[PDB]
Scaffold this motif. Sequence first.
Motif, mmCIF file in Angstrom:
data_model
loop_
_atom_site.group_PDB
_atom_site.id
_atom_site.type_symbol
_atom_site.label_atom_id
_atom_site.label_comp_id
_atom_site.label_asym_id
_atom_site.label_seq_id
_atom_site.Cartn_x
_atom_site.Cartn_y
_atom_site.Cartn_z
ATOM 1 N N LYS D 13 0.872 -1.165 0.000
ATOM 2 C CA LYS D 13 0.000 0.000 0.000
ATOM 3 C C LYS D 13 0.909 1.214 0.000
ATOM 4 N N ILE D 15 2.017 4.781 0.575
ATOM 5 C CA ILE D 15 1.612 5.857 1.478
ATOM 6 C C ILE D 15 2.747 6.858 1.569
ATOM 7 N N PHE D 20 8.444 2.626 6.539
ATOM 8 C CA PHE D 20 7.514 1.550 6.221
ATOM 9 C C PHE D 20 6.440 1.487 7.291
ATOM 10 N N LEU D 22 3.366 -0.723 9.029
ATOM 11 C CA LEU D 22 2.835 -2.076 9.081
ATOM 12 C C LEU D 22 2.091 -2.293 10.385
ATOM 13 N N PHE D 34 9.161 -0.679 17.403
ATOM 14 C CA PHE D 34 9.390 0.469 16.541
ATOM 15 C C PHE D 34 10.135 1.519 17.359
ATOM 16 N N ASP D 37 14.342 0.692 14.393
ATOM 17 C CA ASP D 37 14.533 -0.564 13.692
ATOM 18 C C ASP D 37 14.287 -0.373 12.206
ATOM 19 N N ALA I 13 14.857 -2.312 -0.649
ATOM 20 C CA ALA I 13 14.745 -1.005 -0.026
ATOM 21 C C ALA I 13 14.837 -1.140 1.478
ATOM 22 N N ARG I 14 15.459 -0.178 2.121
ATOM 23 C CA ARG I 14 15.606 -0.237 3.559
ATOM 24 C C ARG I 14 15.230 1.087 4.174
ATOM 25 N N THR I 15 14.484 1.018 5.266
ATOM 26 C CA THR I 15 14.061 2.203 5.980
ATOM 27 C C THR I 15 13.610 1.781 7.366
ATOM 28 N N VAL I 16 13.220 2.779 8.159
ATOM 29 C CA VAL I 16 12.675 2.531 9.484
ATOM 30 C C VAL I 16 11.268 1.980 9.340
ATOM 31 N N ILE I 17 10.898 1.051 10.191
ATOM 32 C CA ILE I 17 9.516 0.605 10.255
ATOM 33 C C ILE I 17 8.837 1.292 11.417
ATOM 34 N N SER I 18 7.574 1.658 11.228
ATOM 35 C CA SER I 18 6.739 2.172 12.300
ATOM 36 C C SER I 18 5.350 1.605 12.098
ATOM 37 N N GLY I 19 4.577 1.578 13.158
ATOM 38 C CA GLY I 19 3.338 0.847 13.131
ATOM 39 C C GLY I 19 2.175 1.690 12.720
ATOM 40 N N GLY I 29 2.758 -0.321 4.258
ATOM 41 C CA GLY I 29 2.903 0.968 3.613
ATOM 42 C C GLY I 29 4.322 1.102 3.118
ATOM 43 N N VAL I 30 4.474 1.475 1.855
ATOM 44 C CA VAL I 30 5.759 1.727 1.223
ATOM 45 C C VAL I 30 5.792 3.175 0.753
ATOM 46 N N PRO I 31 6.747 3.981 1.195
ATOM 47 C CA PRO I 31 6.716 5.409 0.898
ATOM 48 C C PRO I 31 6.894 5.711 -0.576
#
Lengths: 65, 159, 231, 56, 84, 45, 49, 147, 56, 56
Positions: D13, D15, D20, D22, D34, D37, I13-19, I29-31
């Motif tokens: 999705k 956004i 990222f 999730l 979170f 990470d 792709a690598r980035t920070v994950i947040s909920g 969600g993928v920016p």
Amino acid sequence: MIVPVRCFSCGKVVGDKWESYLNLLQEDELDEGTALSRLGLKRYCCRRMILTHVDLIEKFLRYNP
Amino acid sequence: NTTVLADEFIAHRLGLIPLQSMDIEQLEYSRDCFCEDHCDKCSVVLTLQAFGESESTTNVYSKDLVIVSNLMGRNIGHPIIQDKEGNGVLICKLRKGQELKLTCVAKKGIAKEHAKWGPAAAIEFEYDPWNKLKHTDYWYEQDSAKEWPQSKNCEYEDP
Amino acid sequence: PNLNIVLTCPECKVYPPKIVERFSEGDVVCALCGLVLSDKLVDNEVQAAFAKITMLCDAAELPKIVKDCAKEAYKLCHDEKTLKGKSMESIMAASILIGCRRAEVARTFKEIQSLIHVKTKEFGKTLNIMKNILRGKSQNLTYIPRFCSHLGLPMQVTTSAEYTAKKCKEIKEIAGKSPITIAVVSIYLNILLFQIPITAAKVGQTLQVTEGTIKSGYKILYEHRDKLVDP
Amino acid sequence: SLHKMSMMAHRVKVIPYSTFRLNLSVTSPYNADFDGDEMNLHVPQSEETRAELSQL
Amino acid sequence: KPMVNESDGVTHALYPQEARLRNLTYSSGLFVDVKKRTYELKYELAEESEGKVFIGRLPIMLRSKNCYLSEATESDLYKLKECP
Amino acid sequence: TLKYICAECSSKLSLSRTDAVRCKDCGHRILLKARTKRLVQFEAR
Amino acid sequence: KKLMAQIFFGPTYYQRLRHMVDDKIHARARGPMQVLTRQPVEGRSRDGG
Amino acid sequence: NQEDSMIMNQSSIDRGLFRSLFFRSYMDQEKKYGMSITETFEKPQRTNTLRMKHGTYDKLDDDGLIAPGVRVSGEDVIIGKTTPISPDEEELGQRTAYHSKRDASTPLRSTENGIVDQVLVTTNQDGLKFVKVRVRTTKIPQIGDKF
Amino acid sequence: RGNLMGKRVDFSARTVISGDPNLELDQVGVPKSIAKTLTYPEVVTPYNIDRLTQLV
Amino acid sequence: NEVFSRPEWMILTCLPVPPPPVRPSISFNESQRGEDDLTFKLADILKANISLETLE
Ligand SMILES: [Mg+2]
Ligand SMILES: [Zn+2]
Ligand SMILES: [Zn+2]
Ligand SMILES: [Zn+2]
Ligand SMILES: [Zn+2]
């Protein structure tokens, strides 16, 4: 440095208050709890601006351009 | 800008400085006016010249802004002074040879876009000072009535 | 035999290559039809000489650029016929002084003569032949601040001395009798203008100029005091 | 990545902003929380593979 | 005291600010008194006094007794632009 | 030529190419680049 | 509307940290390859995979 | 705000809460190898210069530096540096036609942007002219940011 | 170990994950930036041809 | 194994030289040439060999 204008929460304009604040502290020796009140900072969202503020622009000015 | 303050740091503080919005109703939005960039219909032009004179530290005040743009005789854009001493917001300090000269373009907007347009400071909202509606249960240790402060507005309603 | 690869667009073919290269995508593309041209773009005697030379320039504290210009110079001379000798002491000093020149730094013949004993005149001949070879393979002013250092003189004194040297050279009259005498006398004037004592014997010793020479230069220089005044 | 659970297909999705996003039910199998990470994403390039991910 | 040798050979004191900007090493020179003697056998001839010899440069820790700043005062420091 | 500034005395130099790098009137070899004259724009946001 | 629970609320001192998402996020498709192994380069600044 | 994230006031951010400056300092230097080949700070001309980067050079002043106050962005070139090439040495691609100078210019970081705060030029220990450049940028608290 | 059994790869792709609570379990969600960078080579056919044409 | 493995072959009577792809050069500053350690070793094995040849 140099007196955050407005306020990080309530948005009340805290900038101009700074000078008069230092005036009160130097001139009238009044403690902060009185000073901030007389300045009219009712909420403590504001109060932490003035009180907690650390003014470094002074120590910046002393370098020659 | 010769100041110690970073340039955009300044342009930030200028963004926060309240202006006189009384007649703002009749100033159109930027995107509404058909000119390129700005004009006297969609914007108000302010400028500031600060040149440090004395050996002692000179202070740039909000009152030092000056309105160069034709206002069509409508009440807008005057930087507001609520201080008793008649100075207002402290933008930047200067020592001797440090000079600041810049032009500001004031435009119309609302808070949702950027908080520098927010007209209202904190807004106190309250209802049902006594708990009569029971929208809230009170955390307590022994008794809730003693511990929880009596709200001032309680006076205007019945026990 | 051939082996040289050129990149050309088979669909365009109009010009030779006119392309751009995309480093991030690591690919190279014709700027016209936007076609990708390429992909997956990847990201014994001598040593002894340079050893002792290295030591010499080191003791002399010359910046590496000078050292390396002299190294380069010496490599070109090397084993050549015309040099025909000089025992390796003359060449090291010659090549050094060259690298100094070529480096815009200045060192006096006497100074290098203090690092190495070259016997002088023999040195001049070697230096000239080397100079000729360099041409085949195809300025006092700098000295003035260096001397102030030795005396630890203020900046204004140094710049005054520079104006003095240019003015003195134009006015001619003795043509300089080597630059060193003019540089030292120019100083001696400039300092005596100012109140700062070095007297005379101290500068003659310190800078290794005969006291009689400094005074002799001083009389003629004194005569032209009129036009040497910067402000 | 010490579980076979630690690598799982997902359904993208798009956004705005940066991180990222999730759901938090899935934070446990990754052994993830979170704060600072990061999670590597891998796009399959072939229709075949794309199918395998959804189906396995 | 801490010094710098420029390429041309001009030598001058080094204050740390500039030292940073110019990619320098902040150091002072070292001198040694070398007395040389000759024997012929305990017979003693020789040359002495007159040498003070430069062995090399020694890095200097700021604020130590050797560096120029250790004696500075507040506004003094401000002229040199090293935050007290 | 292009305008520069001295490190200490803050004097305006505008030295040309092949002048090497040094201040005139003092020995400081640190030259500032003398900020651009043309206008720069910000958004207070 | 009032919250049936009351919130523990007050100032506290906070520090922002070096780590910032902008310095971290990167995404690679068909970048440059290391000269040796002709496999994608290492690192964000080098735009590695 | 679950699991060690947190919710932050957008108005508060907008009013300056937790805004910080970031100064990056790019440093570059011109050098010489055998004194035969000298690197030079110059604004490179696309016509005669080879291996040239595709970032726009328009911002450079003649000397090869970006005068401070100029807003720059990633891939822009801060310092125009060039080197000489022997014609016979390579002759790779168009180098025979270009005749002259291989392009070595230190670009700004690909992902960054900001305003050049300060640029200073200075000869180092051994006399080489070299330059430092200081690029300030405001980094506003963002969703990914940490505390 | 380094260059064979595993390796550094593209299309990642690598980035920070947040909920986020509002996402379905399996999604992510993928920016937009990452999305605009990574790509999937789909094949033209009668079905997609119109959609692809629009993309181009 | 009589075909593939002989003690004779365990001893070296001659030696393979990998192509540069095994031992590529790399450039520093892109104006300075960098050589690989394997290349230096080949240079040594050579020089040593030539010496032993002459002395013999
Ligand atoms: Mg964690
Ligand atoms: Zn407040
Ligand atoms: Zn308009
Ligand atoms: Zn083409
Ligand atoms: Zn100066």
